[PDB]
Design a protein around this ligand. Structure first.
Ligand code: HEC
Ligand code: HEC
Lengths: 126, 126
């Protein structure tokens, strides 16, 4: 759905802005600095789940640009792995939010953060 | 969830990038230039429905900036109307996509476009 490589870049940086907001806005709740309302978090995590599947389809062949390292494309199986791993971690977050269990949520949340960071360390330009 | 006014602006332009892509990518299908696969459109419209509720929460008080006219805030009831109208039009698109009826989809799609444009004409800076 992208007329030019720039349009895919702009889409994926857009989608990652939204995902980072929907994940990071929960930080105060995971830390106990903000109140935990199960319904409110369940809802926000559903939003995050839909957003978390969107960036990956905007690294199609020929969308080099942005801060994406070229190795996303020369090692596509490994990049595919990292994103499936991250998406599985979002499943576990969903399950914790759907269970309304804050301890489970905080552990899920740390696993999700580690997997964001694992991918950036291999595939996002310093 | 926004530390500064700029963060809300950046979030809402992000969310509208995504919504414009998920709506506009259907244009060739509504026109008959691309094939109509009901399941594929049903899915994309679900994505669009979640995305279409996201921008509105990022025009909270104090997030002036971007190409948002100040009248979004001095006339908040009317702006609220326009967005509820637009979101209702996305419900009708959903219903057409869920029914797998292309004629209904094309009509829904035109109604959705008109309501995007109606709001821009009143509240988006030329
Ligand atoms: C690969 C499997 C990744 C996973 C998992 C996550 N991110 Fe990511 N991120 C990735 C790339 C290749 C890039 C660069 C994209 C480009 O073309 O520039 C990024 C970028 C970001 C950014 C900055 C983007 C911008 O606005 O230009 C942010 C804020 C970001 N990523 C956040 C983020 C979060 C919160 C994640 C888990 C919840 C996450 N990323 C996972 C690759 C990957
Ligand atoms: C108000 C009720 C709106 C509705 C309905 C739609 N849009 Fe919108 N749009 C609105 C505003 C106030 C703004 C400016 C936001 C800012 O702070 O700059 C916009 C902007 C856009 C943009 C350009 C954004 C950018 O990347 O900076 C686009 C591409 C856009 N809007 C598309 C769009 C579509 C496709 C809509 C219906 C599907 C739609 N908008 C509805 C206000 C409103």
């Amino acid at each position: 759905q992208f007329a030019k490589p720039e349009d895919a870049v702009k889409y994926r940086q857009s989608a990652l802005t939204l995902m980072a907001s929907h994940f990071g806005r929960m930080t105060p709740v995971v830390k106990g600095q903000a109140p935990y309302d199960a319904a409110q978090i369940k809802a926000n995590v559903e939003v995050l789940k839909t957003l978390s599947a969107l960036p990956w389809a905007a690294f199609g062949p020929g969308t080099e640009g942005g801060d994406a390292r070229p190795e996303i494309w020369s090692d596509a199986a490994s990049f595919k792995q990292k994103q499936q791993a991250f998406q599985d971690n979002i499943v576990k977050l969903s399950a914790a939010a759907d269970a309304g269990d804050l301890d489970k949520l905080r552990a899920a949340f740390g696993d999700v953060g580690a997997s964001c960071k694992a991918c950036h360390d291999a595939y996002r330009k310093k």
